[model samples]
Target: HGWTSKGQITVLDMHPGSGKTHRVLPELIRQCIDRRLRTLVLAPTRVVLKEMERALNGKRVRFHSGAIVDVMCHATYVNRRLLPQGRQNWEVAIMDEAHWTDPHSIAARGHLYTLAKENKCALVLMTATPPGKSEPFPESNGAITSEERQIPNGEWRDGFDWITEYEGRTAWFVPSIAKGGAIARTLRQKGKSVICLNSKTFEKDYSRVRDEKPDFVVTTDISEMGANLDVSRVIDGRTNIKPEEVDGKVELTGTRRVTTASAAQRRGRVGRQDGRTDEYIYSGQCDDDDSGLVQWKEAQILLDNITTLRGPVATFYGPEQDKMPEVAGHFRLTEEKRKHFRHLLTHCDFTPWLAWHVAANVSSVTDRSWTWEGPEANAVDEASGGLVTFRSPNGAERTLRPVWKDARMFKEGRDIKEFVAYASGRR
Candidate 1:
């Protein structure tokens, strides 16, 4: 019950089946509604968004998909644009899979942090594995079992066949997209009634895996995130032996290339509470090139080399105040504007979309006029108010009715979380 607060942030570090969406989230949503505090629940991906939609079905929630009372949107929505505090400012922003925030995708990071400052809302950053710097909250009240098991890499392929022999579902995670397709083609040719999911394959029959229920689903790394696949066995085709050079000689070596966090996410998808099944993870070896390094180790690199942007309190009073005198002279500035700038600056280095937006806003402030441009910046140029134009990649252009609406933006970066989110259509 005390997992939420007014203005502080709380991190929930718990396992997948810990009822974060079902049990914990519902309670928090009820509490927020009872207090009449407008709330926003941010799921890391669209798949999880559907799960949240179902969990909060009877509860009051609103979003692009559907909702009743308050707002329930995916992280992608936040990445698109700054949320206008239209009817009521959000007082609580709950982010599931909070660690998935890729600092590289500046807009996603900015929007997330922006919510905290804009509404003075409390934040609940929930994840099985939180970011390295987050302050842990209270103990979780959900069910988590150490019974989850990981088998050796070469073992999972055999394990898949063995489990299927007993008529249990097996989720096979392949390393390459081509491999997954090949496996699916052969399986279907043998009349195995298999399903294949990846960026391309999965997008087409997204509902089949949930509805028809396949015994074996051949897919690439997409299974690494929170896709509710009810299976008894998880075959990690990605974790296999890779070539390495040592002492001027080529040798094969095994590494935890999948990283501990990613391994947990992939393995956690099975043995969920609803239709609990025997969970076994068969992880093999991988080449250093394909392996995912541990998240903390990767983050360490950023922490040392990258100079993170400063926050409001720091900018206003910290030593940097001297460098940004104009920005510092904002003690009376709107808290909304202050917080927005704070988040934008902190994440500007990672996402150019946000950096561009920040540049325009800062220029406007310094010059005291409208300096922003482009689709996001332009609004009813009194002369061009009623018309909207479309430009194709081939440079073809056409004028259309003004139908601009806020939408999510996607860009390239090395942020692990951002890449995962983009691949999974989370943002």
Candidate 2:
């Protein structure tokens, strides 16, 4: 309850079965209801949403009192989809997996930080791991045992069969898309039900994994983020021999490339029950340098988009147990005509889909400058206001709907000094 200001936040870093979601969370919800504090419960992924349901024990809030519980996904809240905060603003916001909600981690979630600053609410974060630690785990109750094998030339094949032992559900995480599919193919050489999920079909594939509940899965770091799988055995395939990054690229030699925070995320796959299982990590070596070097480029992208969307945001220093800005948002927008241009900038994601001439129309949103006609031409009409036609790869002309959002503007040399000034004086 030290959160007295708008952006004031607190964190609860406890073990898995420490009654975090299942026991303590429901009790807090009950307390919030009694005190009539409108609460916001945000989960990161779809799988964890089901975990939320399990935590609540199949009970929905009846709201016999005057308060409300907005149980939603982070994407839903971030995208302006639901709860736009008129009369339904929350007084207390609970981050289910606070690690993923880290402001510097995912660029999109930066909006939440700004929301916390804008709204005077109590922000609470619950995570097993903190921002910077890279270790095995907090403390294990199970009989934990790990092994390492040195494979020559940094190559790991389908030589071992750890799957045949007590492993009803197994997750083999690879380093790349090719490796994941290739491993999945080999796993199917046997009779085990296997599914390989990568970025190409992540949304639908994860949904299938949840619905079908296969025996073994071969995936990349994609599944490692926050998917609540009943997986008992984990094979960090990226461990013990694989291609290492050379220069935003390379396939060379490095084994057991387990970083800091993610190592725990993988090991955390099991023990959702009463903490019972054995963990075996394979890797000729281990990367103990925190999760930075791997996600270094991710930070650049985050910095770019954070400043691009919102001006600046304030982040609370958790270790000190006080809420205030220690880091300002930037490396990240328009020089603003801040009000009118922001609406366009938010929805108008520039892509190669639009013809080169579309750039001229965007310099100013006035006049008949938006009219261009062709199979690859734009029809900028009512939906998004100024129509900058989008010509997709297959060649269908569309408007400035920002559907083509994957193009990353990377390695750009920019200034953060302009951004640092914003956080210097804000409350």
Question: Candidate 1 residues 260-304, lDDT tens each?
Answer: 444555566665655444544454432323212222221222221
- Identify the leading candidate in terms of lDDT: 2
Task: State the displacement of the C-alpha of residue 231, model 2, in Å, after optimal TM-score superposition.
Answer: 3.0
What TM-score does candidate 2 get on C-alpha atoms? Answer: 0.62
Worst 10 residues of 1 by lDDT: 404-413
TM-score of 1: 0.54
Q: For candidate 2, lDDT tens digit of each residue in 142-192?
A: 444555543212233455555544457877677665456666766666667
lDDT of candidate 1 at residue 25, scale 0 to 100: 83
Question: Ten consecutive residues with minimal summed lDDT in candidate 2?
Answer: 405-414
Cα deviation at 415, candidate 2, in Å, is: 33
